[PDB]
Each structure stands twice: as C-alpha cells, then as structure tokens.
Amino acid sequence: MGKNVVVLGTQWGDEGKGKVVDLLTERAKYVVRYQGGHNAGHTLVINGEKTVLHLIPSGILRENVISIIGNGVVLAPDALMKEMTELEARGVPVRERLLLSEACPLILPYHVALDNAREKARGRGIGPAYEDKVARRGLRVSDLFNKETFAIKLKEIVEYHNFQLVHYYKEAAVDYQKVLDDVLAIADILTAMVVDVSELLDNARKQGELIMFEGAQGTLLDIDHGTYPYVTSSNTTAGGVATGSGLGPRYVDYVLGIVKAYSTRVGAGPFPTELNDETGEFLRKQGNEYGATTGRSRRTGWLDIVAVRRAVQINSLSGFCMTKLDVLDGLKEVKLCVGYRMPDGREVDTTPLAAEGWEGIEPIYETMPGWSETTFGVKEHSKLPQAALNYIQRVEELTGVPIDIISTGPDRDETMILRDPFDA
Amino acid sequence: MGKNVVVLGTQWGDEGKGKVVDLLTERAKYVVRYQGGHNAGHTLVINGEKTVLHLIPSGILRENVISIIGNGVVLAPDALMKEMTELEARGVPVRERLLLSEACPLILPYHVALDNAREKARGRGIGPAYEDKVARRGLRVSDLFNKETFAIKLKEIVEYHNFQLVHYYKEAAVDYQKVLDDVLAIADILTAMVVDVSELLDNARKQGELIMFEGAQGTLLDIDHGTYPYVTSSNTTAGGVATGSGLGPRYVDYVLGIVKAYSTRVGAGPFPTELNDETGEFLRKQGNEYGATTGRSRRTGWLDIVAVRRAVQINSLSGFCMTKLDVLDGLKEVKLCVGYRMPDGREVDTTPLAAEGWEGIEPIYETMPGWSETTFGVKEHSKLPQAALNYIQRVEELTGVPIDIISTGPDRDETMILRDPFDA
C-alpha cells in the first residue's frame, strides 16, 4: 500500500506544478484541488499540445482518474462552465470525470465588483468569497439544491453588498435578478456533480487507492505563514489538505514540494534574491516569466535556500520536484542564497518574522559553476551535466530533502522520476 | 519516541476537553491552542479547585510545560490581559510559561461592535476578526512591533468599519484614539511573548519532545464540514492543527476525540437525538448543562453514533476519551442512535449532506440497560458497572475507535487512562 501525495508550490507561486500533477496522476485514482480559486494557471503540455487550467484539477486529462474540486476551493460558476465547455469541445469528457464538494463557496459577480473596487481604492472575487464564507453569510453549492430558498438567501446577500458598493465605493449596484438568472441556468449541471467527498476519500484509503492532492499558488503566499501582508486570502501549505478536502489529517502521507530552479514573485513583497539586472532578464526570458497581462511580469532572482527551508518546515516536505532546471542552461555561474545578512550585520539562515521584517536583507550566496552542456533535452539522469547534478546535490544537502523528480522542459516527457512519491 | 497528540471535541462542543488536556499535559513539553478565540470555556478542577480558561491553553497549570497561543487563534488583548492578571493573582506565573505567535490576529472593539450589530439585525468579535484576516485588512501581533505604523494601519481599519457601523447599522462610531490607547498600554507585554512557533515546533520533534494540541468548540461546528449554516467562523477539526500552529502536517501523530457520553448543542441547528422531555432535563441537571447566560442552556440528547462516525472520519480519530459517563448513572435504559430514518423512509448510517438536509430525521436507536451502581467515584476499570463497560464497548464496536480514556467526574483524578495517547 502506497502513500497519498500532496503536490504544492514551495516558493511564491509559478513553480510549474501543473505539469507535475499531470505526470503523476497516470498512477492515481483521485486528484483533488483543496484550496484557492480559478487562478491556478496550471499548464500542461502533452505531446506538444498545451492545456491551461485554472479551476479544474490537473488530473482531468487522464483516463480512469476522477478529479474532485474539494470544499476548500471557492468556485465561480461561470468560470467552471467555461473551462468545462472548452475542454469538452476538445476531446475531454469533463462531466464523466469531475466531482464537486457541496461545501464549495460560490464566487458571484458582486464579489468581482467588491474585489475590483477595493483594488481601485489603492480569478477575481476569490478574497471576497472567502470573507463571506467566514461570516457565514455567503452561498455554497449546497444552497443550489433548493432554488426557492437559494433566491431568498441570494437576495439578502446582494442587498448587503450593494449597500457598500453604492454608498462606500460609489459603484453601480449589482442586479440581483441577473445574478440569479445566470446561476439558475447552470445550477443543475453543478448539483449533478456533487458527492460526499469525505466518504469517498475515507473509502478510497480502505479500498487501497491513493489520492493526489493539488495545491495552487505558493507556500510563502500562505495567509498565516507567508510574507504578511504580501500573502493570499487562504492557506497555501500542505496543512490545508485536510480541512480543504475532508481527508483525515493523519493520512497526509507524502508531501512533494515543487521548487523552481530559480525564484519568482508576481507583484509586491519581499524578495531577497531579486535580480534587477541582466541575469534577471535572462531568467525572465528563458523561463517565459512575462505573465499574461500588465503588471504580472514576474520579478526573478536566484534560488533562495533560506526561504525554501521555511517551506520545508511548514509543509513537512518529503521530497522535491525541481522544475525549470533548463532555464539556467549556459550561465557561467549560478548562485544559491544560503543566508540573510540583516541590516544590523547579523547573518541568519532562517526567514525573519514579520515582527522583524525583511527590509534591507542582503542575500549571502554560494556561487557554483554553471553548465554549458544543456539540461534541456535530458531524460536520463546519467546524461545530466555534472555541474547540474552538483547544483541539485547541493540543494539536497542544504535542505535535508531529496530531489526525487527533475524537470527539464514543459512537456510531460521532459522529466526524470528518480523516486515515485506514491511508494510505500 | 512517542506521538504528538491533538485533543478536540467530537460533537457540537462542551465535550469536557479542558480537563483532559490538563490531565495529559503532565507529560508534554508544549501545549498549543490552534484555533478559535476567547470562548473556549475549558474548565479544570484540580484537588477540588476550579479554573476556567477561555484563551490561555489548558496546560497553563502545569510546571515545566510551555503553553503557546498559535497563529490560528484570534486574540483579544483585553481578554488575554484579564486572564493573565487573574491567573497571576493566584499562584500561576503566566508570563514565564506562555508564548504567542506573531501571526495571531487581534480582536479589537470595533469587531465586538460589528458582531453585536449583526446579531441584533436578526468571545465577542471572533468572526469579524477572522473576516478581516481573510481580507488582509486586519491587524496581528506582528504589527505591534512598530507603534508608528501600527497607528496608521489601525486608523485605516477603524475608519473603514466606522462607515458600516454608522451608516448601515446606525450605531455609534468607534473611537480610534481610545482603541489605540488601550492597545499601546499593553503592547509590550504581548510582544515580549513572541517566538518563532514554527521553528520551536520543528525543533521540538527533533529534540524528542512531544506536543499537545488543544482544539475548542466541536467537530460538527466546523465551518466547512459541520452542520452548515449552524457552524462557527473557523475550522474546528484536527486538520486545522498544521495551518493554525505551523506544525508540519505529516506530524499529526495521534488524534484524541473527546466524546461526551450524551449529546448537547447550544443554540440552533439540527439535532436528531434531541430530548425535549424529562430525560433531557435529567441530562441537563446531572451534567450541569445550563450554561452561563440567557439562551445558552444546552439542548441535550442521546449519544449520536451516526454523527460521531462523521467526526471519526473527518478527524481520522485515533482514540476517544469518553467524558461525563457519570451523568448517565441511574437511568434504567440508555440509547445510542445508530441510524437516521429520513423523511422518505430510507434508513442511513451516515450524516446527510447539507444538500439533502437534516430536516425531519427520526433517530434509530439501540436501547441498552443502564446501571444503578454508579460510575461516579470509579477510578479502577474493573470496578465500573458491567452495563457501563458494555456501553463503552458498544461505542467502540460501532465506531471502530477505542475508548482509551474514561472520565467519571470533573476532577483530574476522576479518570482512567487505559492507553496513554503519547505512546509510540
């Protein structure tokens, strides 16, 4: 009997998780998303054909695998329908393969309105949906099973948020009836996918099946443990799997940290190893880190072992998959940040508390030879350049965590699984 | 090397957890609260002397034990200071023994204002504090380390909530300066208690020390998995331990479910085994279930094995501690609810989805002999009445989970630890 595997990003997002979940599902019976919303941006490339997923889990392209959107995921019905319809217009029989938790909150248009108004005052609507959830004033998939009381609950919530939208934000009121109409048009599609996820997952273990759990975003964006206030609206660590799916918490068997070979952040927040130079532009170009829209070009920098150590700790990582190793190809030297020099001159090897702050940190690096022979194109471990093998080894040494999977390109086949994480 | 132990309520609260955490700490090095606020109501009786704790963890009366308020706990500074000062006026050197996470949100008076206004429209301020947390608009202990920027952040948040309080709720504006003044008077006391909790807990495992985690409230009040919408503002299951403390999620070693020998709920929500008869009043009297204020007299009912099975599943319980067994003393017969008869006549042994609803359930009982010889006064397992031993056995059989600890009164010594949960 093997181990459930939780796959999550160890850094500040964009670690290249989608590819890894898809490659590893081939084995699994269930793939379960357990937190966040429709902003995963998880990219699969199979025989050169690209798929992008934001909401639907990254096992959806695999036969005989059941994908589940667990309760920890906030669900925009319009977004789910769009992804469903587009996968379906391709070969992918989504409705055969996809189940939903009744406990998923609904993201509706007033959440998008609130989110935008808030941002102006300085995957849309995710935060406001989580907020309504905490207040127990929101809606869930479970509310769709009685359309009459759904309408009554919806009217109350729309009225509530319209007060703020109109009087505080000076924005247009959201039209209750339009919101209702659009939900009613698709309600039966969503309710047909509902199952008792807790019971399914319990039974799965007893049946000898293993579960893959898919996280989005990145460990150091975790609402509690990340770089506060530059964090997201939910927990992103492996500790969310139980509460976000109904899995019993003793059954978090193996935690696979996806660690990109270099660092990125999108938007503001502390970033000790940030490179605002030609090396940084090289990483951005070679790693295709420009994003999709204004202001979402990723900041780039060297791999930060101090920060990664924090992710090892809060996730209890079992092993790593290192991604995008090929991006470093050709660099004369590569660097690992192994310590932080604080403004007072102290040298530390642990991330600072928000109490102290990240301001003014100087990274302390180990510099190592790069490789001119490529890792791109490599599918046999013994054919990796020795300097790349050494880089990998050094990260293992510094973290105490093995690199069990190495990725050298975007395709499912540009990968070496040294130890399959499902093993007993 | 033994097992970290998570102690939590398996039902709808008031399971009698405080006593169990205190009895079991005697062994532990750390005791960690990981969710909720200052409404735990955890009651300790040691050599006949009562202590009530709402916020401070239930290990605080034990020497050589370090108590920690982890990040998942929302913290009202006034409440912490009051509990501290009162324990300290007794023998208890709180400040020697108590650490705080910098990531604890602060509950401030505007949260109390919002909470009350909301309730009118139909442990104060807990929900609104969790809501501000999700929005990343709130304050944390970490914000107290710069008093100048604390003031700026506080002004913004007070202004924001005052708009709603004044214009929507028609209540008085909260006085920013008074809120500030009261926080500044005690800030240094709180910041002095801050430690890197994640690092401490990681090191503790490696050091060979074990950790006790204390939950509040009850499993079926869990925001996701409980009886929605009759649930609390946070997760209450064992799956919150990792995110609420920084413990690595693979290190949830043993989960001890506190299960009261009969059922209670406070306030509204589904309750299949509810007894609105003389048996119910007997349980209320003998179990001291009247609460402390208007509207908090507990509804009482028989032990509900269908519901407890749900708690076994979502918590992955390792074992039970059965509490308040003595309350049943003298009943001619006792009952266990082993199934639910739905309004359509189907008989099921799993809790219904919110999608289906709990309306109209008829409990299906096993009826068993009670005991006239008391369990009260019993401290040797072989001296329990056989009918009580049989009741215990039957709950084990129905749930598949052993009853490892039996409690027969409120005192620390009115207990039989059959298997200590810390064992490897």
Tell me, letter by letter, the H, E, C secondary structure of chain B. Answer: CCCCEEEEECCCCCCCHHHHHHHHHCCCCEEEECCECCCCCEEEEECCEEEEECCCCCCCCCCCCEEEECCCECECHHHHHHHHHHHHHCCCCHHHHEEECCCCEECCHHHHHHHHHHHHCCCCCHHHHHHHHHHCCCCEHHHHHCHHHHHHHHHHHHHHHHHHHHHHCCCCCCCHHHHHHHHHCCHHHHHCCECCHHHHHHHHHHHCCCEEEECCCCHHHCCCCCCCCCCCCCCCCCCHHHHHHCCCHHHCCEEEEEEECCEEECCCCCCCCECCCHHHHHHHHHCCCCCCCCCCCCEEECEEHHHHHHHHHHHCCCEEEEECHHHHCCCCEEEEEEEEECCCCCEECCCCCCCCCCCCCEEEEEEEECCCCCCCCCCCHHHCCHHHHHHHHHHHHHHCCCEEEEECCCECCCEEECCCCCCC
- Token reading at B277: 């008869």
* Identity of residue B103: A
Residue in B263, B264, B244 with CA at minimum distance from that of residue B36: B244
Residue B14 to residue A385: CA distance in whole angstroms: 62
Q: Considering only residues 34 to 63 of chain A, which have any Cβ-Cβ distance to chain B shorter than 8 Å?
A: none
Question: What is the dihedral angle through the alpha carbons of A143, A147, A148, A149, rounded to the nearest 10 degrees?
Answer: 0
For chains A and B, count residue pairs whose Cβ atoms are closer than 8 Å.
191
CA B14 to chain CA mean position, Å:
8
- Give the distance from residue B33's alpha carbon to the nearest chain A alpha carbon, in angstroms: 15
Query: Residue B386: what are its φ and ψ, rounded to 5°?
Result: -60, -35
Q: Is B54 a catalytic residue?
A: no
Which of A71, A233, A241 comes nearest B136 by C-beta?
Answer: A233
Angle between helix A305-315 and helix A386-399 axes, rounded to 10 deg: 50
The answer to whether the B1-101+194-258 and B102-193 domains have the same CATH topology is: no
For residue B353, count other CB atoms closer than 10 A to its CB.
21
In the block, tokens 């669900």 appear at A75
Q: Considering only residues 198 to 217 of chain B, which have any Cβ-Cβ distance to chain A shorter than 8 Å?
A: 198-199, 202
Q: Is it true that the peptide bond before A369 is cis, omega within 30 degrees of 0?
A: no
Which of A145, A167, A249 comes nearest B249 by C-beta?
Answer: A249
Beta strands in A139-233 (DSSP E): 211-214
CA A325 to chain CA mean position, Å:
19
Residue in B128, B122, B131, B123 with CA at minimum distance from that of residue B110: B128
User: What burial class does residue A27 get, using C-beta atoms within 10 Å of its C-beta: 0-12 exposed, 13-18 middle, 19+ buried?
Assistant: middle
Mark yes or no for CB contact A136/B223 under 8 Å. yes
Residue B383 to residue B32: CA distance in whole angstroms: 35
Q: Which CATH number fits domain B259-424: 3.90.170.10, 3.40.50.970, 3.10.20.30, 3.40.190.10?
A: 3.90.170.10
Mark yes or no for CB contact A313/B202 under 8 Å. yes
Residue A4 to residue A246: CA distance in whole angstroms: 14
Residue A165 to residue B313: CA distance in whole angstroms: 42
Residue in B3, B2, B6, B43 with CA at minimum distance from that of residue B245: B6
Say if CB B107 and CB B75 are below 8 A apart: yes
Residue A336 to residue A125: CA distance in whole angstroms: 37
Say if CB A252 and CB A4 are below 8 A apart: yes
Residue list for the binding site of B for Mg(2+): 14, 41
DSSP state of A406: E
The residues that bridge with B391 in the sheet, in sequence order, are: none
Q: Is it true that the peptide bond before A270 is cis, omega within 30 degrees of 0?
A: no
B-chain CB neighbours of A310 within 8 Å are 198
- Token reading at B366: 């096993």
Percent composition of chain A: helix, strand, coil (DSSP 3-state, to 5): 35, 20, 45
Residue A259 to residue A243: CA distance in whole angstroms: 24
Residue A130 to residue B223: CA distance in whole angstroms: 11
Antiparallel, parallel or unpaired: β B403-407 and B319-323: parallel
CATH class of B1-101+194-258: alpha beta
Say if CB A310 and CB A220 are below 8 A apart: yes
Residues 6+ apart with CB under 8 A from B422: B2, B3, B5, B24, B27, B28, B210, B254
Query: Residue B333: what are its φ and ψ, rounded to 5°?
Result: -140, 155
Residue in A62, A15, A23 with CA at minimum distance from that of residue A40: A15
A26 touches B: beta carbon within 8 Å: no
In the block, tokens 């401290």 appear at B379
Q: For the CA atoms of chain B, what is the radius of gyration?
A: 22
In this structure, whether the domain defined by A102-193 belongs to CATH 1.10.300.10 is answered with yes
Residue list for the binding site of A for IMP: 14-17, 39-42, 136, 217, 232, 296
Say if CB B138 and CB B129 are below 8 A apart: yes
Count the residues in chain B. 424
DSSP state of A404: E
Say if CB B9 and CB B218 are below 8 A apart: yes
CA B306 to chain CA mean position, Å:
21
- Nearest 5°: the CA angle B388, B390, B396 is 110
Range A154-159, long-range pairs (CB < 8 A, 24+ positions): A154/A108, A154/A179, A154/A180, A154/A183, A157/A110, A157/A132, A158/A110
The residues that bridge with B6 in the sheet, in sequence order, are: B213, B255
Say if CB B220 and CB B307 are below 8 A apart: yes
Which of B102, B202, B313 comes nearest A198 by C-beta?
Answer: B313
B194 touches A: beta carbon within 8 Å: yes
Query: Residue A205: what are its φ and ψ, rounded to 5°?
Result: -60, -45
Resolution (angstroms) equals 1.6
Q: For the CA atoms of chain A, what is the radius of gyration?
A: 22
For residue A166, count other CB atoms closer than 10 A to its CB.
13
B339 touches A: beta carbon within 8 Å: no
Residue in B81, B68, B318, B305 with CA at minimum distance from that of residue B182: B81
Residues 6+ apart with CB under 8 A from A207: none
B309 touches A: beta carbon within 8 Å: no
Beta strands in A96-163 (DSSP E): 98-100
A-chain CB neighbours of B241 within 8 Å are 239, 249
A-chain CB neighbours of B310 within 8 Å are 198
B255 touches A: beta carbon within 8 Å: yes
A-chain CB neighbours of B353 within 8 Å are 102, 142, 194, 196
Helix (H, G, I), strand (E, B) or coil at A28: coil
Which of A141, A237, A353 comes nearest B243 by C-beta?
Answer: A237
Residue B315 to residue A242: CA distance in whole angstroms: 9
Q: Where are the domains of chain A?
A: 1-101+194-258, 102-193, 259-424
Q: Considering only residues 347 to 386 of chain A, which have any Cβ-Cβ distance to chain B shorter than 8 Å?
A: 350, 353-356
- Give the distance from residue A226's alpha carbon to the nearest chain B alpha carbon, in angstroms: 10
Count the residues in chain A. 424
* DSSP string of A254-310, one letter each residue: EEEEEEESSEEE-SSS--TTB--SHHHHHHHHHTT---SSTT-PPEEE-EEHHHHHH
